[PDB]
Amino acid sequence: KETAAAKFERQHMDSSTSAASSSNYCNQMMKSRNLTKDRCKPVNTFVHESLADVQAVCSQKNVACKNGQTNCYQSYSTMSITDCRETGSSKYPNCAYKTTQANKHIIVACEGNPYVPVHFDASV
Ligand SMILES: [Cl-]
Ligand SMILES: [Cl-]
Ligand SMILES: [Cl-]
Ligand code: NA
């Protein structure tokens, strides 16, 4: 039974690569992180920075989350990310994703002690 912080790591961290270098990156990563078990998760972002750099965002710019909560933080610098989004021809169990690599600021919600990311809100 997964902690919120561990779920964030599984869904959103990929420090092992600097960027998505292939159109099939999302198909592979969404499957290997178990995000296509039982359903195709429609949208998911992977961050290509160290865990420490992503955890550090919880001490950066405090901003509102989309849902109105005030525990969101925007990274001061841009970060390498990959957005994964289901295509129109995707349907479980043959989930299919579009891969879009970008360099953007990330916005995360933080909670707990230690105070770490638990939700990926957006990128800018
Ligand atoms: Cl898992
Ligand atoms: Cl996401
Ligand atoms: Cl401020
Ligand atoms: Na947690």
Side-chain angles (χ1 to χ4, degrees):
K1 166 34 148 29
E2 204 171 22
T3 67
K7 180 177 185 177
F8 178 93
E9 292 164 347
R10 177 174 60 86
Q11 295 189 312
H12 300 299
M13 293 300 310
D14 181 15
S15 315
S16 73
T17 63
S18 62
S21 28
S22 152
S23 61
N24 292 316
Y25 172 90
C26 288
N27 289 334
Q28 296 177 228
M29 284 292 295
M30 294 296 286
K31 177 150 169 284
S32 60
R33 296 302 179 85
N34 292 324
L35 302 178
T36 66
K37 198 141 177 63
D38 300 312
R39 66 190 248 293
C40 310
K41 187 179 179 200
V43 175
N44 189 69
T45 302
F46 290 101
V47 183
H48 306 286
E49 305 290 344
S50 70
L51 183 58
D53 281 358
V54 173
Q55 290 172 335
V57 175
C58 296
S59 304
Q60 294 180 19
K61 185 71 163 191
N62 181 218
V63 297
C65 314
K66 284 187 79 62
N67 66 2
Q69 301 181 242
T70 66
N71 62 323
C72 279
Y73 294 85
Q74 183 163 317
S75 63
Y76 292 145
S77 68
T78 59
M79 294 188 170
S80 174
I81 65 169
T82 306
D83 195 31
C84 298
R85 286 203 173 228
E86 258 192 304
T87 64
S89 63
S90 172
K91 85 184 243 258
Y92 186 81
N94 296 281
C95 305
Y97 292 89
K98 179 181 162 64
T99 298
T100 307
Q101 171 69 32
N103 287 98
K104 298 197 296 246
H105 306 264
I106 65 167
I107 298 146
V108 293
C110 301
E111 285 183 21
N113 215 293
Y115 196 61
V116 295
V118 291
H119 159 82
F120 193 91
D121 206 59
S123 47
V124 176

